[PDB]
Amino acid sequence: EYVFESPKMKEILEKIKKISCAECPVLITGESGVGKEVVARLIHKLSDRSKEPFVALNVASIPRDIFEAELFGYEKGAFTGAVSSKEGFFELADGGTLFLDEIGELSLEAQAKLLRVIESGKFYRLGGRKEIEVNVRILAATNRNIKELVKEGKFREDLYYRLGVIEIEIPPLRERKEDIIPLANHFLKKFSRKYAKEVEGFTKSAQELLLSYPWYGNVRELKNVIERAVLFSEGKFIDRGELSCLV
Amino acid sequence: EYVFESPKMKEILEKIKKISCAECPVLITGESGVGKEVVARLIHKLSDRSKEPFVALNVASIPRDIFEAELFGYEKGAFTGAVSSKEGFFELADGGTLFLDEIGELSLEAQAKLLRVIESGKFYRLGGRKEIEVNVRILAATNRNIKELVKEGKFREDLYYRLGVIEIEIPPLRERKEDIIPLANHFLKKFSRKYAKEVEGFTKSAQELLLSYPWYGNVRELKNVIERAVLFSEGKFIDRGELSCLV
Amino acid sequence: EYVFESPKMKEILEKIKKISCAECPVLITGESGVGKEVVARLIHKLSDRSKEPFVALNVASIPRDIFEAELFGYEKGAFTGAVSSKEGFFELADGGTLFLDEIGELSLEAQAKLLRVIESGKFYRLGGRKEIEVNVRILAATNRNIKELVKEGKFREDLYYRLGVIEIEIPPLRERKEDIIPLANHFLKKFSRKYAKEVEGFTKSAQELLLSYPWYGNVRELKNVIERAVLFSEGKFIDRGELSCLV
Amino acid sequence: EYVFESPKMKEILEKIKKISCAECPVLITGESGVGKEVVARLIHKLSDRSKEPFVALNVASIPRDIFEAELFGYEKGAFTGAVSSKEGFFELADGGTLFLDEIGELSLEAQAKLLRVIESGKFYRLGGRKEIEVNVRILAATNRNIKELVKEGKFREDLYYRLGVIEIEIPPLRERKEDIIPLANHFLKKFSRKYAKEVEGFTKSAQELLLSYPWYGNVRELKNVIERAVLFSEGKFIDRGELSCLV
Amino acid sequence: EYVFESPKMKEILEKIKKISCAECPVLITGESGVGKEVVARLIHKLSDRSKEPFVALNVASIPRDIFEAELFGYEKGAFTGAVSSKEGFFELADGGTLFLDEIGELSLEAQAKLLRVIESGKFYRLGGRKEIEVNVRILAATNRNIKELVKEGKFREDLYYRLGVIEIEIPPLRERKEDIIPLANHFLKKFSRKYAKEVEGFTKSAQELLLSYPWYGNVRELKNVIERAVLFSEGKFIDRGELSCLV
Amino acid sequence: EYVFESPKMKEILEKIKKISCAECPVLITGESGVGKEVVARLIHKLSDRSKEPFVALNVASIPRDIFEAELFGYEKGAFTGAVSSKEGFFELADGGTLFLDEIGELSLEAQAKLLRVIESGKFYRLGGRKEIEVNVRILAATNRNIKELVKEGKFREDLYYRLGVIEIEIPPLRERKEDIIPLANHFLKKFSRKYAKEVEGFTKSAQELLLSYPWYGNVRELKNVIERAVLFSEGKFIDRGELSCLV
Ligand SMILES: [Mg+2]
Ligand SMILES: [Mg+2]
Ligand SMILES: [Mg+2]
Ligand SMILES: [Mg+2]
Ligand SMILES: [Mg+2]
């Protein structure tokens, strides 16, 4: 029930399918909320590992202190690791997919780590002396400008080219007019079901406005305004008037 | 025992009733002392979760060191995470409401963390390998200009659109003239009760004065100014003279 | 055993007596050494809570790292916060009075933290999940111009209105003529006993200049200047000559 | 083995004797090496507490991170301050004398901290809930112009008046002609014993020069310069020639 | 295996022999690579403490954060972690010699720290309440102009007089021309043994050139240049041509 | 597995072979990322140290905070560095070779630290009291202008003379055109094997492009262009068109 219509978005769909069997890093770019996450989840579904686990992880929320430990895991004992060994996120994602959103926020200390992972697929647990090898597909995404961040010295160049093999840039919504209404209608149908309203579709007078709004919030802001509209809707159709005060 | 008179305030009151059944984020804005906390606390009472827990957080008072840990909780080891697993504020608010006060005073480093929580309601405990999903309706407030702070890059654009589902603009008190006199009477009644004075109500001269002060502290300073008057009061009524030295 | 003579200070004394039963925050302002601490300490004595504990705190010296911890208290989930639970200063002062001196010396970062404490009297221990409520009367002092600092954006406006219930302006000593000579006799009498000198009082020739010195240190330097004089005194009386080299 | 000959220095010596029984702050000023340390040590010896502990501290050498802790001491808690409680420097000096050298080298942020300590002799240990009271005579020294630094707003005015009870301005060596030679003989005599040379005294030609050098280092450089000469000395007397390469 | 020919160096060699019995600070100056480290090391060998420890430190390479800790040492606690009491470099050098190399690049903030340490040799451990007294001979070296920096206010005057007991200014190699050829021959013989080549000596044409190079790197560049030639050498002698591309 | 065709590289290859037995520093210059690692890794192979470890590290990309820690290593002491007893890159490379890339892009603060390391190979562990000596061959490289930066004071002169023994230039890739096709085929072979494609070799039309083109990325972009091209390749040969969109 996901929407891909515009040529640019349709092109991505084909591109994704071609790499479904690929075991190599992917870097997703675009403004935040252009559906980069859906793309990441889609790659998992269309691959041969689709039946395997899909691990979603926020890398920012991870404390710098335990970062290495929580990712790669740790063995029993070994620096206050209690009496028990515990797996890391990579091992949990073994054979599956690991998705890093907002990867662009990471300490240079931490960025340098994981470097040796991507290509070699090998690492050591904290305090473990036995090398472990795992099979993991790495996916990364950011709403930032990756190209510039390297130049500003906030991101290591050497890491970019490993991750920057394949790059899919979801363009902003304002340049996708064809994808506006189809998305807008789908959400209406969705929110109408959860909140249980009588609403169906949009007036043409309203339809023109949605087109002429250059969506700085992309498809998220879009999803949100409708949720407001559906709640404040009265009749079976939503006019420009109800949205006029909203935009 | 809450005061809503002015037209602008009545419009907001209705909106709250409409969202009684709403499970989605709300962003409250306004100057200092316009009752932002009350609104947040009020929405909970008029919702279906009213008997369930209401969690108040200043979100500033949270130490950056344990910030990640205290919110998402942690498992039985952190690197000395003691012997016990311990819940976070989010799990505490499960089925209930979580209120983030003065969120705009929060560091960009920290904002990015909360990101996948708001929309997905999914996160990881520290050292935990099991994804946890919880249901919490999130309330946020600031006395700053959130709209502009994003433009100035002091606040994440990506976070705003997640919280910015519903946006309530509480106007200043100076634009609510009708809410002036009624409030002042309420506080007087209250403080007369606490301090046990003989005071009942206001002179016409004082009432007139209260109108011409543009309440830079809004309804906070107001409560304070009245409390001041009650202590220094002698008779049963408050004249312009007792307030003359106050303004 | 204190000195109140001048009309302005005698005028101040009455206000204190009226609010003895008041449970609300007080902010004392003025030049350095004008007796801000005695006033604050006095208010406790003249109140109905006078028999309860009085907590004196210089809020400058608190390190930012434990700032959160030392105030609100903490549980054993403090990252090797040992095995023991510890109360905070607010909880210790429950039912009593808490005096925050030099509040104006706080970083805007630090100020926002205190915010929900002052007004709500509610907070969370670090790692605690149950809200704690305390009854604390707030006393405040600063050497700054508090009114101006707000306009300069160096002090949070939202915090001022929480603390700014009652405002007391202690004037400089140069504007208090009546309180000059009486104080001097008090200190001389005091130090004469401590140091065991033969000195009794001041000559009229000495006394006239002492009034015409605009005491930039207010009453500290005087107390100090007299402390200096007794030690260098010879006879039973102090002439203009002994004080001439001091000014 | 301390040298006081010059009239200027003898007056100071008298000042010291009169305050022997006095308990209160003393502020020493002057160029570097004018014997500020000697005086401070001297005041202690000639006092009634001379038998009590003397704590010498460079408040510059204290790292900004633990500064708060090292002074006031701490109990088990906070900091992740491990498992051991420790007294602070003030408690160590209780009843005795504390000497702060180069106090003028202290950060303005840090200065404000000391305030309620110096005057009241009252504080809280870090993590301690018991107010501790100590009796401490405060000694201070600086290589700057303390009076001027205040006018430039680089030093707290409020702290100065706390510390500024007694004021000692040690003059430069160039203004002490009488203290030159006597000091020089002392240094020569001492080093002659330590290094075991045959030197006794100065030529008349050499003596003339020592006065005509405007001793920018006061008596430090002097002690060093003599130390230089003794080492390169051959005969029983030191001529201008051996000093020519030094001065 | 050291070379001293030039008058300037021979004078210096003698000065050192005279201080063999000296326990006092030494400040070494000169351009980079003039043998400041060996000279400092030499003074130790020729002193009575030559068998006692010689502690070498790059005081730049010390992190600004722990600078205080590693020098003065620390006891249990009084830092994050640090479960063990630990000595420091000053304490390590007791009875011996401490060499601070490249001392002149140290921050003004940092210089003041060492101040009560250098001359008095007394300090407190981090977290220690017991004064430590040590006997350490201090050696200092820099590629800067120390005397001039003082007038420029980039270096503490108060510190200068402490280190500036004995001052040795190593002249450049260009004015030591007599020391050029002997050194070059010395290096040639050395590298010839290590690399095992057939080379013996220099042509006169080459020798003339070596003199006409104003060696801005003094003896480092020279040492390097000889090492370069030997590796690319063919015959038993090195002509001016092989060096032409080097200069 | 290295490719040498162009005249400049063939003569350069000889330089390395003659110095095979040399134990001394080498400074490599060139545009960014051009076989600098390849040259350096090769020199090790041809050395007597070929059997010992080779540690490659980017010394610029490491944050200043742990900069000190990662180089010399650290003990269980200062920091905050937990229990980790960890070798530093210098200690890790003992007996082997250490390669520092883009050292010229490093901040002056950091340069001064490493100073005593390079030449002496001597240092202290952080918190360690035992002098450590290592035997390491130093290899250095930069994408900067080296010598000229010194004149601009952007690079320390004292440091340059340590590293500047041997100097290599290397051509840009555009002047090595003979080495284009051989290299391109080798990398092509790699990705075909790893990714399992049907590709064999290049079309003549593709070769036409390979000749005339501003490769500013030298041999980096080539690896990227092929890695991109191979993945999007369809047929058995690569045409001019698919490479066109990559540039
Ligand atoms: Mg995202
Ligand atoms: Mg609030
Ligand atoms: Mg005060
Ligand atoms: Mg001193
Ligand atoms: Mg050196």
At B232 the three-state DSSP class reads helix
Q: For residues A141 and A101, is the Cβ–Cβ distance under 8 A?
A: yes
Reduced to 3 DSSP states, what percent helix, strand and coil does chain B have, rounded to the nearest 5?
45, 15, 45
How far is it, in rounded angstroms, from Cα A186 to Cα C78?
A: 48
User: Would an 8 Å CB–CB cutoff place D131 in contact with chain C?
Assistant: yes
Phi and psi torsions of E170, nearest 5°: -70, 115
Q: Which residues of A are annotated as a binding site for ATP?
A: 3, 32-38, 143, 162, 220, 223
Q: Between residues 196 and 235 of chain A, which touch chain F (CB distance below 8 Å)?
A: none
Cα→Cα distances B181→B162, C22, F153, Å: 38, 24, 71
Please give the radius of gyration of chain A, using alpha carbons only, rounded to the nearest integer: 22
**Is D36 annotated to bind ligand?**
yes
Task: Give the whole-angstrom CA distance, residue A48 versus residue A52.
Answer: 9
Q: Helices C180-195 and C204-211, interaxial angle, to 10°?
A: 120
Which residue type, as a one-letter code, is found at position D154? Answer: K
Q: How many CB atoms lie within 10 A of CB B179?
A: 19
Token pair, residue B90, equals: 């989010």
Torsion of CA E195, E201, E204, E207, to 10 degrees: 50
For residue D28, give the DSSP letter.
Answer: E
Do residues B15 and A245 make contact, with C-beta atoms less than 8 angstroms apart?
A: no
Single-letter amino acid code for the residue at E93: A
- How long, in residues, is chain E? 247
Contact assignment for A109 to F228 by CB distance below 8 Å: no
Q: Which helix (H) or strand (E) holds B141?
A: strand B137-142
SS3 D232: helix
Residues 6+ apart with CB under 8 A from F76: E83, E84, F83, F84, F85, F127
Contact C76, C82 (CB under 8 A): yes
Mutation pick from C37, C38, C54, C61 vs chain D, by most beta carbons of D within 10 Å, is C61
Report the run of H or E that residue B210 belongs to, with start and end.
helix B204-211
Those residues with Cβ within 8 angstroms of residue B238's Cβ, 6 or more apart along the chain or in another chain: B188, B199, B201, B202, B203, B206, B229
Residues of B in contact with A227 (CB under 8 A): 24, 165
Residue C39 and residue C18: Cα distance in Å, rounded?
14
Q: 3-class secondary structure for chain A?
A: CCCCCCHHHHHHHHHHHHCCCCCCCEEEEECCCCCHHHHHHHHHHHCCCCCCCEEEEECCCCCCCCHHHHHHCECCCCCCCCCCCECCHHHHCCCCEEEEECCCCCCHHHHHCCHHHHHHCEECCECCCCCEECCCEEEEEECCCHHHHHHCCCCCHHHHHHHCCEEEEECCHHHCCCCHHHHHHHHHHHHHHHHCCCCCEECHHHHHHHHCCCCCCHHHHHHHHHHHHHHHCCCCEECHHHHHCCC
Q: How far is CA D68 from CA D64, E79, F78, in A?
A: 8, 12, 19
Residues in chain C: 247
Annotation-wise, does E88 bind a ligand? Answer: no
Would you identify the CATH topology of the domain E174-247? Answer: Helicase, Ruva Protein; domain 3 (1.10.8)
Alpha-carbon span A33 to B164, nearest angstrom: 13
* Stretch 4-63 of chain D: residues touching chain C, C-beta under 8 Å: 18-19, 21-22, 24
A217 neighbors A183 (Cβ within 8 angstroms): no
**Contacting residues for E152 by C-beta, under 8 A, at least 6 apart:** none
Chains E and D touch (3+ CB pairs under 8 A): yes
Which residue(s) pair with B99 in the sheet?
B56, B139
What does the alpha-carbon distance between residue D80 and residue A65 come to, in Å, rounded to a whole number? 15
Cross-strand partners of F96:
none
d(CA E20, CA D155): 46
Long-range contact set of residues E40-45: C-beta below 8 Å, sequence gap at least 24: E40/E99, E40/E101, E40/E139, E40/E141, E41/E99, E42/E2, E42/E16, E43/E16, E43/E19, E43/E139, E44/E97, E44/E99, E44/E137, E44/E139
Residue among B70, B217, B232 minimizing CB distance to C18: B232
- Do D175 and D215 contact (CB within 8 A), yes or no? no
- The DSSP element (H or E) to which B208 belongs, if any, is helix B204-211
Phi-psi region of A78 (alpha: psi -120 to 50; beta: other; left: phi over 0): left
What is the C-alpha separation between D148 and F155, in angstroms, rounded? 40
At a CB cut-off of 8 Å and minimum separation 6, what does F32 contact?
F102, F143, F217, F218, F220
What is the rounded CA–CA span in Å between residue B201 and residue B189? 8
Percent helix / strand / coil, chain F, rounded to 5: 45, 15, 40
Provide the resolution (angstroms): 3.6
Extract the tokens encoding A183.
Answer: 């998305």
Sign of the CA dihedral with A73 first, then A77, A80, and A83 last: positive
C-alpha distance from residue B2 to each of B172, B179, B186, C118, F203 (Å): 17, 11, 9, 22, 81
Calpha distance E142→B147 (Å, rounded) = 55
Question: What is the 3-state composition of chain D as percent helix, strand, coil, each rounded to the nearest 5?
Answer: 40, 15, 45
Q: Give the ligand at the shortest distance from the Cα of D29.
A: 4
Q: How many CB atoms lie within 10 A of CB A150?
A: 17
Phi-psi region of A89 (alpha: psi -120 to 50; beta: other; left: phi over 0): alpha
SS3 of E90-152: the string is: HHHCCCCEEEEECHHHCCHHHHHHHHHHHCCCEEECECCCCEEECCCEEEEEECCCHHHHHHC
| Chain F residue whose CA is closest to E126 | F78
DSSP letter string, chain C: -----SHHHHHHHHHHHHTTT--S-EEEE-STTSSHHHHHHHHHHHSTTTTS-EEEEETTSS-TTTHHHHHH-B-TTTTT--S--B--HHHHTTTSEEEEETGGGS-HHHHHHHHHHHHH-EE--BT--S-EE---EEEEEESS-HHHHHHTTSS-HHHHHHH-SEEEE---GGG--TTHHHHHHHHHHHHHHHHT----EE-HHHHHHHHTS--TT-TTHHHHHHHHHHHH--SSEE-HHHHHTT-
Contact E60 F19 (CB under 8 A): no
For chain E, domain boundaries: 1-173, 174-247
Asked if D21 and C195 count as a contact pair (C-beta separation under 8 A), the reply is yes
Burial status of residue C196 (CB atoms within 10 A of its CB: 0-12, 13-18, 19 or more): exposed
- SS3 assignment, position D43: helix
Number of CB pairs < 8 Å for C and D?
84
Closest among B178, B177, B189, B175 to B223, alpha carbons compared = B189
Report whether C185 belongs to an annotated binding site: no
**Rounded Cα–Cα distance for residues F40 and F56 (Å):** 10
Angular region, D6: left φ>0, alpha ψ -120 to 50, beta rest? beta
How far, CA to CA in Å, does F113 sit from each of B30, D47, E145, E219, F165? 52, 48, 19, 21, 20
Q: Of F92, F95, F114, nearest to F103 (Cα)?
A: F114
Our CA angle for B175, B178, B180, nearest 5°, is 85
Question: Which distant-in-sequence residues (6+ apart) come within 8 Å of C108 by Cβ?
Answer: C154, C155, C156
Q: Which amino acid is at A144?
A: R
For chain C, which chains pass the contact test of at least 3 CB pairs under 8 Å? B, D
| Distance set, CA C31 to CA B22, C11, C129, C173, D194 (Å) | 54, 18, 43, 9, 56
In CATH terms, B1-173 corresponds, of 3.90.1310.10, 3.40.50.300, 3.20.20.450, 3.20.20.70, to: 3.40.50.300
Q: Copy the structure tokens of residue B85.
A: 């697993």
**Which secondary structure element, helix H or strand E, spans residue E160, and what is its range?**
helix E157-163
Distance D35 CA to ligand 4 centre (A): 8
SS3 F111: helix
What is d(CA A94, CA A111) in angstroms, rounded to the nearest whole number?
21
Decide if B57 contacts B98 (C-beta within 8 A): yes
Interface of D with E in 63-92 (CB under 8 A): 63, 65-66, 69-70, 79-84, 86-87, 89, 92
Contacting residues for C161 by C-beta, under 8 A, at least 6 apart:
B32, B33, B217, B220, B221, B224
Contact A36, A169 (CB under 8 A): no
**Most C CBs within 10 Å, among B224, B227, B233, B246, to test the C interface:** B224
* CA–CA separation, E102 and F109 (whole Å): 13
Report the SS3 class of residue F28: strand
The contacts of residue B139 (CB under 8 Å, 6+ apart) are B25, B26, B28, B40, B43, B44, B97, B98, B99, B100
Q: φ, ψ for residue E111 (rounded to 5)?
A: -60, -45
Provide the shortest C-alpha distance from residue D130 to chain C (in Å): 10
Partner residue opposite B227 with nearest CB, options C113, C157, C165: C165
The token duo for C167 is: 């405002």
On whether the CB atoms of residues B163 and B27 are closer than 8 A, the answer is: yes
